[PDB]
């Protein structure tokens, strides 16, 4: 049984639930999306062989800080996520998630994932952030953060349109095969 444990960390701005629901169901835009993903594995085809892709969201809330790391043993690959339209969630990649992952799992490969790619050039969202002295995270800014935390890849995706979405999971698998 070829089995990969992929753990997802990131703030509430990220849409971790939509990311994992969109990937595992390919539900149509407009369908009811639950509050939490249920952390069930997905079987995926890699070079004519079955791979069991264990997909775990973590309980990101600060009151679960002490116990969240019990999710981390034997993790094969981490997706550290931020929203491209939340600078605070991007700074929490290096301020919170990277140090937390590295405390428990010094050597496990990290993929840096920017989500909500579909909003980075939504007129109403660009206007909204403008009014607060903010700008969406750009591709080069993301790449720089990936180098800073020693991520093996930086990828950007949209749960809504599935632009970039398959590549995140393809690269997660590739990172564990090396």
């Amino acid at each position: 049984m070829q089995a990969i444990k992929c753990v997802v960390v990131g703030d509430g701005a990220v849409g971790k639930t939509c990311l994992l629901i969109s990937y595992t169901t390919n539900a149509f835009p407009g369908e009811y999306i639950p509050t939490v993903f249920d952390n069930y594995s997905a079987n995926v085809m890699v070079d004519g062989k079955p791979v069991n892709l264990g997909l775990w969201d973590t309980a990101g809330q600060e009151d679960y800080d002490r116990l969240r790391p019990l999710s981390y043993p034997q993790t094969d690959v981490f997706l550290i996520c931020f929203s491209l339209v939340s600078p605070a969630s991007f700074e929490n990649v290096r301020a919170k998630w990277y140090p937390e992952v590295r405390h428990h799992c010094p050597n496990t490969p990290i993929i840096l994932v920017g989500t909500k790619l579909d909003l980075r050039d939504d007129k109403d969202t660009i206007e909204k952030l403008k009014e607060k002295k903010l700008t969406p995270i750009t591709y080069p800014q993301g790449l720089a953060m990936a180098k800073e935390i020693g991520a093996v890849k930086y990828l950007e995706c949209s749960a809504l349109t599935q632009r970039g979405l398959k590549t995140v999971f393809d690269e997660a698998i590739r990172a564990v095969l090396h």
């Binding site: 049984m1 089995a3 444990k5 703030d11 509430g12 701005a13 009811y32 639950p34 509050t35 939490v36 993903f37 249920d38 952390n39 069930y40 594995s41 079987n43 085809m45 062989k49 079955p50 069991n52 264990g54 775990w56 969201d57 973590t58 309980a59 990101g60 809330q61 600060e62 009151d63 679960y64 002490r66 116990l67 019990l70 999710s71 043993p73 034997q74």
Partner: protein, 216 residues
């Protein structure tokens, strides 16, 4: 009217199904850290249950956040002048679900049953089925998987996966695979779900599990 109530009722059922699945997998990491010991009085269990039921942080993985999502839908029903009795009935279902989880998570026997059920769901999902309808495939296999009452006791700090995953994976290939050259199941495997292959699958999974449970 009945249509708007049916849609919110179905959405509530989706919320609870996803949240109960997640809650038990999250609680399972506390049991794994205790090498398969169940004790609702421990510091880690008490904190895990409290936070995953009651965390108030926006975006929390918690029943309190699920309840917020359901409150949006019941407010919308009242805005749409849906009969108060139908909206109250949805709210009492959600109160029932909270009360039922709050009782189960402080009962060692109820905890064991929740964890053994999730172990079963995880082991069904380990079967390498790459066909069109994986929910219907697992619904056909599910009645032939009977796990022991002490299945939870095999969660160990050092194990990535519960060992039953490998047992369902290998027995599913042995009894349902269309050839020895295919390491996986698909729509061509469905004809192999005869009463004969399913009963044999059942017996073989029970024997591999018993051998594992009795290993010195």
């Amino acid at each position: 009217m009945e249509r708007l109530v049916k849609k919110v009722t179905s959405n509530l059922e989706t919320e609870l199904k996803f949240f109960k699945g997640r809650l038990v997998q999250e609680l399972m990491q506390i049991v794994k850290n205790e090498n398969g010991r169940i004790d609702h009085t421990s510091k880690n269990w008490q904190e895990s249950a409290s936070v995953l039921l009651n965390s108030q942080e926006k975006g929390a993985v918690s029943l309190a956040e699920v309840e917020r999502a359901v409150s949006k839908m019941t407010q919308k029903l009242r805005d749409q002048k849906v009969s108060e009795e139908e909206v109250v009935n949805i709210e009492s279902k959600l109160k029932f679900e909270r009360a039922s989880l709050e009782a189960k998570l402080f009962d060692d026997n109820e905890i064991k049953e929740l964890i053994n059920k999730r172990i079963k769901e995880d082991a069904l999902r380990a079967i390498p089925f790459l066909g069109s309808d994986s929910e219907s495939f697992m619904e056909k296999i599910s009645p032939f998987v009977k796990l022991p009452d002490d299945s939870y006791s095999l969660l160990k700090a050092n194990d990535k996966h519960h060992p039953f995953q490998n047992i369902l994976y290998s027995n599913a290939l042995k009894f349902f695979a269309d050839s020895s050259d295919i390491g996986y199941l698909n729509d061509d495997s469905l004809k192999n779900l005869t009463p004969e292959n399913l009963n044999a699958f059942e017996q073989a999974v029970a024997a591999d599990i018993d051998k594992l449970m009795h290993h010195h």
